[PDB]
């Protein structure tokens with residue numbers, strides 16, 4: 001049995017969960033649920049990313065403490081993820097004593113080992129508020145086209161890009177005061193010292209080809225020292241021995257993966273597992289599921305931080321693409337920027353889990369939620385292929401055979417075809433070729449429905465003396481449903497629970513080798529109903 005620690009990226013505390021987050025958390029959860037079904041020790045770890053200047057300022061604007069605000073969003077996030085049945089073993093916060101201690105420990109080791117440099121930089125500063133301004137908190141007039149009210153390093157009228165120091169008549173977004181350049185000592189992590197180590201990691205063949213290609217572009221451009229400090233006022237962790245200095249959010253954020261695991265171990269009273277998973281000699285596996293917009297932090301800064309502080313590095317990074325809706329980036333004006341909470345007012349979680357899983361692969365390409373296709377595919381595949389095998393057969397079993405399945409399989413060869421597919425389907429789940437697994441499963445579902453059509457139970461049922469034939473056919477279909485629901489158990493947790501209640505059995509991966517014979521099943525109300533485009537139209541309207 002493997003020991004596996006899996007994470008998803010830590011959601012920003014000052015935004016609601018949306019369908020882009022859900023792609024990542026669903027992808028990870030399907031993989032995690034499969035690994036648990038194969039008997040491994042799995043720890044699925046996440047947390048909110050709760051630090052930084054935007055959070056500090058938003059809390060001030062709301063007139064509440066940052067602690068109050070992040071606490072409220074953590075609850076909102078966890079409610080949403082729970083509604084999608086994301087099966088975390090722990091959901092913590094980067095704003096935690098565990099992450100503080102681990103961030104201070106890693107920093108102190110990096111510093112003792114020679115990987116922290118001090119250098120003075122010059123940055124725009126709001127003298128009224130009394131704070132350095134990140135680029136997006138500076139506004140002014142575009143130096144090229146003279147358009148007013150442009151933010152940060154780019155103009156949304158003419159498209160020009162420039163340093164915010166080039167803005168005409170610059171203003172602080174916080175106070176309206178004119179910012180000035182001010183010097184400040186910053187601490188830098190010496191990423192370039194890890195170049196050779198990181199290049200060897202890139203060539204090993206573990207990472208997604210597309211990610212390794214991006215890494216080569218970054219090595220070509222040249223690694224640079226990384227500014228990991230921010231001046232007060234800040235919401236984050238203060239740097240030991242450096243009054244008025246804080247760790248930049250992105251330094252402490254991946255350490256939050258460790259902090260969340262430490263929290264889980266401590267709450268369990270488990271004094272051994274943290275070191276078993278994070279020491280350099282670990283035999284446990286560590287996987288980060290992440291989006292393509294945060295590769296650099298996880299593939300360059302993070303392994304180097306771990307190496308330099310005497311911890312193990314990730315076994316793999318699993319990177320996915322962006323979510324599009326109807327082929328395009330999510331659009332507020334079109335109602336396609338869809339929150340996870342809004343989704344659940346209109347559809348169940350299983351429908352989206354299924355749709356994403358059917359499109360996902362081991363590559364980093366974007367995943368398109370085409371809403372018309374969503375309706376067609378859920379109805380065709382879930383209602384009419386898989387659930388149909390239960391719904392078309394269970395009525396006869398319950399009404400004419402007292403709920404009892406036949407004592408033998410009607411078509412043992414066909415059953416073996418279904419169980420023989422377990423190796424390829426499981427390999428597809430394992431390798432993250434989710435679309436391939438779904439295609440195989442639905443090909444089997446087509447065979448199962450062809451079997452039932454060939455036996456014509458709606459004819460057999462009306463013909464005198466054919467009761468045994470009817471029970472045989474319907475029991476065979478139910479056993480095929482049992483197998484397909486096992487293969488789909490990582491994908492469709494709630495439907496699976498309903499299937500298990502109907503079948504009077506928990507679905508295990510190995511259990512498919514023992515069909516249900518001479519076995520009582522239960523009645524059920526609709527296992528899964530059809531959806532329609534009116535519901536899609538309502539979702540879109542509700543999201544505008």
Ligand SMILES: CSCC[C@H](N)CC(=O)O
Nearest residue numbers: 009010011012049253254
């Ligand atoms: C350690 S992963 C942290 C991920 C960031 N919170 C994503 C973002 O804010 O864009």
Ligand SMILES: [Zn+2]
Nearest residue numbers: 142145155158
């Ligand atoms: Zn301009």
